[PDB]
Structure 1
Amino acid sequence: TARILYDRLKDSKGLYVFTDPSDASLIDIQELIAECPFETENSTEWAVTVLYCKEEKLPDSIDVPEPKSLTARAKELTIWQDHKGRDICVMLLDSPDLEAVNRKLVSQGLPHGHPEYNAHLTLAYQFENNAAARLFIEECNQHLQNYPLFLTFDGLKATRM
């Protein structure tokens, strides 16, 4: 039932909206990555960005989404690179729910910080892609295909920045 408290934030410079995995989904993610050979963000850090908005003049009002359930399918793990070209392990999410929330925010004058919204959950921000890590990612993606994993998120949480 966590929700975007827009009017408390309407006068901020920028808007960050994220959602947190449910208790059950936290346990599901932990069991998914049980055999991971590299260190990962801990369970308190796992969050899914829904809006990264650097607009300094936010709209005065909006139609706030307030979805009733937030679901996503854990599609796969893949490797991204950060500013300094360091490897990042992220969990790609297939989520019509989160796409819809992001679209609802962007269409009302809240621009997202990337040309397309890519729902994902970052699992490791600094990551040595070695044979063990690659085997882990491969087996996890095969597991994600053989056993569909759906995640649920509890609310929408908004902060400045």
Structure 2
Amino acid sequence: KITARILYDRLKDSKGLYVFTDPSDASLIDIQELIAECPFETENSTEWHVTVLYCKEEKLPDSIDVPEPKSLTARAKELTIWQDHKGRDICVMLLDSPDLEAVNRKLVSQGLPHGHPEYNAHLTLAYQFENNAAARLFIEECNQHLQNYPLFLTFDGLKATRMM
């Protein structure tokens, strides 16, 4: 009967091993169309990366094994607003994706614990934006559109960055 509001421990740019996948070029356009009426500032498409692992271990390998390549798929479930440890707003697109969850699981199975207690598939669309009634109304209209017109996404091959 009550829903919890989300304070997210954003590991972006901190030391560790960051494994991610990008929406396919086709999916980048589909997402951009989705948010084409957004009244607040959004991250450029080039900045849309989907984390599949953020491992904070102090000793890390140079390379990692990845699952057999495939067209990874997700449904764009909804847009929502989280806050980070500093109180700043994050607008994220939540992803329903057994594929991304299984990738996360397979990567962790190599002795690379994920930096959050539970894996959450999402991509970040805005940060420190103008969060007013117009912003929240746009997000609600986007969420209705994601229900009335289901949006399915595909993602590229995995990439990894080590913040050393």
TM-score, normalisation: structure 1: 0.87
- Segments of structure 2 that go 5 or more residues without pairing to the other structure are none
1:63 is displaced (CA, Å) by: 4.4
1:128 is displaced (CA, Å) by: 2.5
> Cα deviations across residues 106-149 of structure 1 (Å, max 9, x unaligned)?
12210111011100010001122211001100000000001010
Tell me the C-alpha RMSD between the 2 structures. 7.6
1:35 is displaced (CA, Å) by: 0.4
Matches of 1:48 and 1:67, distance apart in 2: 16
Q: For residues 89 and 145 of structure 1, do their structure 2 counterparts lie closer, same or farther at Cα, with a shift above 3 Å needed?
A: same
Q: Secondary structure at the match of 1:9?
A: coil
How many residues are aligned here?
161
Q: Secondary structure at the match of 1:62?
A: coil
Residue number in structure 1 paired with 2:101: 99
Q: For residues 8 and 76 of structure 1, do their structure 2 counterparts lie closer, same or farther at Cα, with a shift above 3 Å needed?
A: closer
**Which 10-residue stretch deviates more, 71-80 or 53-62?**
53-62
Verify the 8 A CA contact 2:8 2:85 in the aligned structure 1.
no
Verify the 8 A CA contact 1:3 1:66 in the aligned structure 2.
no
Q: Secondary structure at the match of 1:15?
A: strand
Residue identity (%):
99
Verify the 8 A CA contact 1:3 1:155 in the aligned structure 2.
no
Verify the 8 A CA contact 2:7 2:83 in the aligned structure 1.
no
Verify the 8 A CA contact 1:79 1:88 in the aligned structure 2.
yes
TM-score, normalisation: structure 2: 0.86
Q: For residues 120 and 157 of structure 1, do their structure 2 counterparts lie closer, same or farther at Cα, with a shift above 3 Å needed?
A: same
1:58 is displaced (CA, Å) by: 2.9
**Which 10-residue stretch deviates more, 121-130 or 13-22?**
13-22
**Which 10-residue stretch deviates more, 63-72 or 5-14?**
5-14
**Which 10-residue stretch deviates more, 60-69 or 113-122?**
60-69
Q: For residues 55 and 28 of structure 1, do their structure 2 counterparts lie closer, same or farther at Cα, with a shift above 3 Å needed?
A: same
Matches of 2:10 and 2:90, distance apart in 1: 34
1:64 is displaced (CA, Å) by: 2.7
- Segments of structure 1 that go 5 or more residues without pairing to the other structure are none
Q: For residues 65 and 137 of structure 1, do their structure 2 counterparts lie closer, same or farther at Cα, with a shift above 3 Å needed?
A: same
